Amino acid sequence: MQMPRRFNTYCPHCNEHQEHEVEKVRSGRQTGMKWIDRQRERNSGIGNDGKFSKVPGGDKPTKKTDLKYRCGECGKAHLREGWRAGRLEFQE
Amino acid sequence: TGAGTPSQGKKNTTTHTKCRRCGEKSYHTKKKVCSSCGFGKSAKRRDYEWQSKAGE
Amino acid sequence: GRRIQGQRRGRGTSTFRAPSHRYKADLEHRKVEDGDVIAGTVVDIEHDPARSAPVAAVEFEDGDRRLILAPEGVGVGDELQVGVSAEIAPGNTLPLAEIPEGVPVCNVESSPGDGGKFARASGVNAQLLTHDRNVAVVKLPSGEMKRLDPQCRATIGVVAGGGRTDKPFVKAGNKHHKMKARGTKWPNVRGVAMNAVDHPFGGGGRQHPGKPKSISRNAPPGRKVGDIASKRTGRGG
Amino acid sequence: ARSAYSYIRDAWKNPGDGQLAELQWQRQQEWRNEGAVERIERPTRLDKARSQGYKAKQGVIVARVSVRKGSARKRRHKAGRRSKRQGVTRITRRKDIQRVAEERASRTFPNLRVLNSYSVGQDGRQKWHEVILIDPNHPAIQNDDDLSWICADDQADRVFRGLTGAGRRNRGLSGKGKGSEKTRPSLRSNGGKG
RNA sequence: GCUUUACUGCAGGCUGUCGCUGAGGACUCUCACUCCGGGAGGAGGACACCGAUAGCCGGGCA
RNA sequence: ACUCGUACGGUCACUGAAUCCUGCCCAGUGCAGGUAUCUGAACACCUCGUACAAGAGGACGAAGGACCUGUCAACGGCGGG
RNA sequence: GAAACAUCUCAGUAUCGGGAGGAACAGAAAACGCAACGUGAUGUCGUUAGUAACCGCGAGUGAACGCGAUACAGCCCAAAC
Ligand SMILES: [Cl-]
Ligand SMILES: [Cl-]
Ligand SMILES: [Cl-]
Ligand SMILES: [Cl-]
Ligand SMILES: [K+]
Ligand SMILES: [Mg+2]
Ligand SMILES: [Mg+2]
Ligand SMILES: [Mg+2]
Ligand SMILES: [Mg+2]
Ligand SMILES: [Mg+2]
Ligand SMILES: [Mg+2]
Ligand SMILES: [Mg+2]
Ligand SMILES: [Mg+2]
Ligand SMILES: [Mg+2]
Ligand SMILES: [Mg+2]
Ligand SMILES: [Mg+2]
Ligand SMILES: [Mg+2]
Ligand SMILES: [Mg+2]
Ligand SMILES: [Mg+2]
Ligand SMILES: [Mg+2]
Ligand SMILES: [Mg+2]
Ligand SMILES: [Mg+2]
Ligand SMILES: [Mg+2]
Ligand code: NA
Ligand code: NA
Ligand code: NA
Ligand code: NA
Ligand code: NA
Ligand code: NA
Ligand code: NA
Ligand code: NA
Ligand code: NA
Ligand code: NA
Ligand code: NA
């Protein structure tokens, strides 16, 4: 479906309606220094590594919307519930 | 030839004999080893924890 | 499954061992200080149970009585010589350097003084081709060109008993008698005639290998069977 | 002023540099031709030996032992085993090489008792350690105030029960506080979790 | 019990790297080390073997 | 162990005396050779990060793979229209 | 056992190899860290506590300091000279 790049809506920070910019959430890079990372190294040994021997699941036929709504005046973003959408294109 | 009765006829070979060290008829005269006390194999006396129940 | 036959071999049990106690002599070249003043006389010609080929009993000047890997044409009374200055006649042993190029040779040493390793079976021979101060090129019975130290000793002539292979065994019994004199398990049951538990080719409602016969060099023992690292198979192309 | 001994010590801090390096490269050639346990008249590292209890006296013995480098020489499972217990290559023994060396020496001299030991280097495939053993029956030792303690009956086969310095450290008894909950007073009394 | 391109691992083989290991992206050498030689000595040589580790193959086996 | 052995050897497989013979197929799978280029781990090396370290990235690139070739008395195949 | 099963669990259990004593082992801090102007070798018992910690964060697993007790004990080298 189509969707406006910018539009007026509620900003939970400013606490009043203002022009927001919508952007798709870009994946942040992992550091490899989280607890789970240390547990992987620590607990992996001879033979099967339990949970660490598992491999990535599958895919749902359609994914939900993953967006960032940026307040055009205070510059602070907020998140919303996504909805299933095969494709999502921004208008402008 | 049947593996039972008919095969029992050729059994005239002496193997286990009275042991010099323990007195049991377990000294295998062909191997020169007592299957009961270990004579011929070890200076120490043959013994195992599995010869009795674990908590005993 | 169970260990395959090739694995049972390595354990060196009675069934797979050679009847060593029945063998005559370990055929190695004599050791000479230098000079070559070592000659002997052929006293007898005997059968070698380990090679199905004749061997010669020689009595050396210094009282040494030993069996020697006999080339064709050696007989009782003949005088054989071993050393640098040895005459260039059949049956004598001298380093490759003293041997004239183009002369058939047998019982060639791999490393000088090892007593001989190459070309020792019935009727075979190596061909000394090139000389040098550094290397003596010898063509082995397999057709391979082997670079050797000119100091490697060798015997002039082709190995005796040539043509042994020309006659067919004809019957199982003949093979049997020969096999009894070797370190080999015989007869041979085909893998495909066995049960799956006993061989990679065993099993099935009919007889056929359950996969391609060409096996990788890296295959582990118990699995390395069939055509080992075959560069090709068949006859065509 | 510096003791002469301090110089032997300082040399051994870096066995791959200076004169010591050349010494080791020469010695090991002879060592590799020697047996498993070789009694030697004098310690290669005098300072270390004296520091550990050695004395140029009757009943004090020194022997160099060579032990192979690496992990456990282990046989693969011949029956059912869960993946965790199927390993062979990465398994290492719980007793350090120095301790193995000490036991091999004590076995060679059944009447003697292990006092201590130290390293004298290694090549690519083996390590060498010199073990100081003591004759608990010789009167020159039974009368020594510093060594007579080793003559007591409860010190028999001390190396085999881990009562050696290398034994005690390897048993995790070094620390007296945190980390020694399952080591002191013994690995066995703690359920074998040390 | 058996099979395999089932899941997961484990031997084994191949290969890089570190240690043993030294002198002057291709090269020379000798001193460790290896092999031949009864010995003198010869061949090979910082490679190989061995110890450690990494990638690939791996129903041979669990 | 083979081996007191050395290619006229001995190991690993298939077929199964003699006689007349044994066609076509290398695409898939297997084995093997080659390979400009692509891909390809760790150590060491370079950049960033950290007064150090974790970590991120780069450069180089072995066997292997991609790719090319050989091979069926190698696994096997020899149809519809 | 986890109602399958691979890590986990059974369990450092069964069993195996080596060895001491009348008891073993431990033991006079490179400790503790109720953080202190504090405690003062080591075992063990009671408790701390199923607490902290671990764990397909599932099932399960699981201390310590301290405290109250028992009994109390503190020393010898290496080196300097
Ligand atoms: Cl989206
Ligand atoms: Cl034959
Ligand atoms: Cl002892
Ligand atoms: Cl306190
Ligand atoms: K289990
Ligand atoms: Mg693992
Ligand atoms: Mg029966
Ligand atoms: Mg021989
Ligand atoms: Mg034939
Ligand atoms: Mg036979
Ligand atoms: Mg057959
Ligand atoms: Mg059948
Ligand atoms: Mg099978
Ligand atoms: Mg058939
Ligand atoms: Mg067939
Ligand atoms: Mg206790
Ligand atoms: Mg040798
Ligand atoms: Mg299976
Ligand atoms: Mg269950
Ligand atoms: Mg569950
Ligand atoms: Mg537990
Ligand atoms: Mg604590
Ligand atoms: Mg004093
Ligand atoms: Na851990
Ligand atoms: Na088959
Ligand atoms: Na002893
Ligand atoms: Na532990
Ligand atoms: Na069954
Ligand atoms: Na094909
Ligand atoms: Na092909
Ligand atoms: Na269950
Ligand atoms: Na079940
Ligand atoms: Na777990
Ligand atoms: Na208190």
* Spatial separation of the C-alpha atoms in residues C145 and C61, rounded to whole Å: 36
**Contact A47/D at CB under 8 A:** yes
Q: Which residues pair with A64 in a beta bridge?
A: A84
Give me the D residues in range 2-31 that sit within 7 A (CB) of strand E: 16, 25, 28-29
Q: Which residues contact B54 (CB under 8 A, 6 or more apart)?
A: none
Beta-ladder partners of C104: C127
Which amino acid would we find at residue C64?
D
Report the gap between the CA of D91 and the closest CA in chain A (Å).
9
DSSP D151: G
**Distance of alpha carbon C27 from alpha carbon C8, whole angstroms:** 29
**C-beta of residue A24 within 8 angstroms of C-beta of residue A67:** yes
* Overall domain count for chain B: 1
Backbone angles phi, psi at D101, to 5 degrees: -60, -45
User: Whose atoms come closest to the Cα of D190: which ligand?
Assistant: 16
Number of H helices, E strands in chain C: 2, 12
Nearest to A47 by CA among C207, D77, C52, C148: D77
- CATH architecture type of domain C1-78: Beta Barrel (2.40)
**Where do we find the tokens 């390993």?**
D87
The C1' atom of F67 and the CA atom of C193 lie apart, in whole Å, by: 40
Query: Å from D78 to nearest chain A CA?
Result: 16
3 state DSSP class of C148: strand
Closest nt to residue D28, judged CA to C1': E32
Q: Report the alpha-carbon distance of residue C69 to residue C63 in Å, rounded.
A: 19
Question: DSSP of D2-26, one letter per residue?
Answer: --SHHHHHHHHT-TTSHHHHHHHHH
C153: which strand partners? C95
**A to D CB pairs, distance under 8 Å:** 16
Q: Where are the domains of chain C?
A: 1-78, 82-159, 160-237
| Binding-site residue ranges of B for Zn(2+) | 19, 22, 34, 37
CATH number for the domain that contains residue B47: 2.20.25.30
Contact yes or no for D70/D93 (Cβ under 8 A): no
Dist CA D194 CA D191 (whole Å): 8
Q: Which amino acid is at D150?
A: I
Asked if residue C151 keeps its beta carbon closer than 7 A to nucleic acid strand E, the reply is yes
Type of residue found at A71: C
Q: Tell the burial category of D1 from Cβ atoms under 10 Å away from its Cβ (0-12, 13-18, 19+).
A: exposed
Residue written as token pair 């009282």: C63
Alpha-carbon distance of D177 to D194, in angstroms, equals 14
Q: Report how far apart, in Å, the C-alpha atoms of C190 and of each of C194, C198, D40 are.
A: 7, 11, 61
Q: How far is CA C232 from CA C214, C215, D150, in A?
A: 9, 12, 73
Nearest to D69, CA basis, from D109, D125, D30, D13: D125
Which residues have a Cβ under 8 Å from the Cβ of B8 and sit 6 or more positions away?
A: none
Domain C160-237: CATH class, spelled out: few secondary structures
Q: How determined?
A: X-ray
- Establish whether the CB of C34 is closer than 7 Å to any nucleic acid atom in strand E: yes
Q: How far is CA C13 from the centre of its chain?
A: 23
CATH classification of the domain holding D185: 3.40.1120.10
User: Using an 8 Å Cβ cutoff, are C207 and C12 in contact?
Assistant: no
Beta B25-28 vs B16-18: how paired, if at all? antiparallel
Range of the domain at B50: 1-56
Number of domains in chain D: 1
Q: What does the block give as tokens for A43?
A: 């607990």
Q: In the CATH hierarchy, which top-level class contains the domain C82-159? A: mainly beta
Q: Is the CB of A56 under 7 A from strand G?
A: no
Tokens linked to A12: 């939970």
- Tally Cβ neighbours within 10 Å of residue B46: 16
| Cβ separation D87–A48 shorter than 8 A | no
What is the three-class DSSP state of D146?
Answer: coil
Å from CA of D108 to ligand 26 middle: 7
Distance in Å, CA D158 to ligand 3 centroid:
4
Q: Going along chain C, which residue ranges are E strands? A: 39-48, 53-60, 65-68, 79-81, 93-95, 104-106, 126-130, 136-139, 145-148, 153-156, 214-215, 227-228
Q: How many CB atoms lie within 10 A of CB D73?
A: 9
C1-78 and C82-159: identical CATH topology: no
Strand E lies under 7 A from the Cβ of residue C197: yes
Paired tokens of D112: 């003697």
Question: What is the Cα C235 distance to its own chain's centre?
Answer: 27
What Rg, from alpha-carbon coordinates, does chain C have?
Answer: 22
Structural domain span for residue D187: 1-194
Look up residue C170 and give its two tokens.
């004809």
Cα–Cα distance between C42 and C64 in angstroms, integer? 12
Residue linked to tokens 């390590």: D127
The three-state DSSP-derived secondary structure of D40-88 is CCCCCCHHHHHHHCCCCCCCEEEEEEEEECCCCCCCCCCCCCCHHHCCC
Residues of D in contact with A49 (CB under 8 A): none
> Which site among D83, D91, D92 would you substitute to test the A interface, given the most A Cβ atoms closer than 10 Å to its Cβ?
D83
Distance CA C229, CA C215 (A): 6
Distances (CA, A) of D142 to B12, D58, D137: 63, 11, 7
- Give just the sign of the alpha carbon dihedral D12, D14, D17, D21: positive
Query: Do residues C137 and C97 touch, judged by C-beta distance below 8 A?
Result: no
Strand G nucleotides, any atom under 7 Å to a protein CB: 6-9, 12-16, 18-22, 24-33, 41-44, 54-58, 63-65, 76-81
CATH: 3.40.50.970, 3.10.450.80, 2.40.50.100, 2.40.37.10. Which one for A1-92?
Answer: 3.10.450.80
Q: Measuring from the CA of residue C213 to each C1', which nucleotide is nearest?
A: F74
Whether cis (ω within 30° of 0) applies to the bond prior to C187 is: yes
Task: Tell me if D119 sits within 8 A of D132, measured CB to CB.
Answer: no
Using the CA of D31, give the nucleotide whose C1' is nearest.
Answer: E32
For D43, phi and psi rounded to 5 degrees?
A: -65, 145
Are the C-beta atoms of D139 and D71 separated by less than 8 Å?
no
DSSP string, B2-55: -SSGGGGTT-----EEE-TTT-SEEEETTTTEETTT-TTT-SSPP--GGGS-TT
The CA-based dihedral angle spanning residues C179, C183, C186, C188, taken in that order and rounded to the nearest 10 degrees: -130
In sequence order, the 6+-apart residues with CB closer than 8 A to the CB of A91 are A2, A3, A4, A5
Question: Which residues of D fall within a CB distance of 8 Å from A46?
Answer: 83-87, 90-91
Contact A86, A28 (CB under 8 A): no
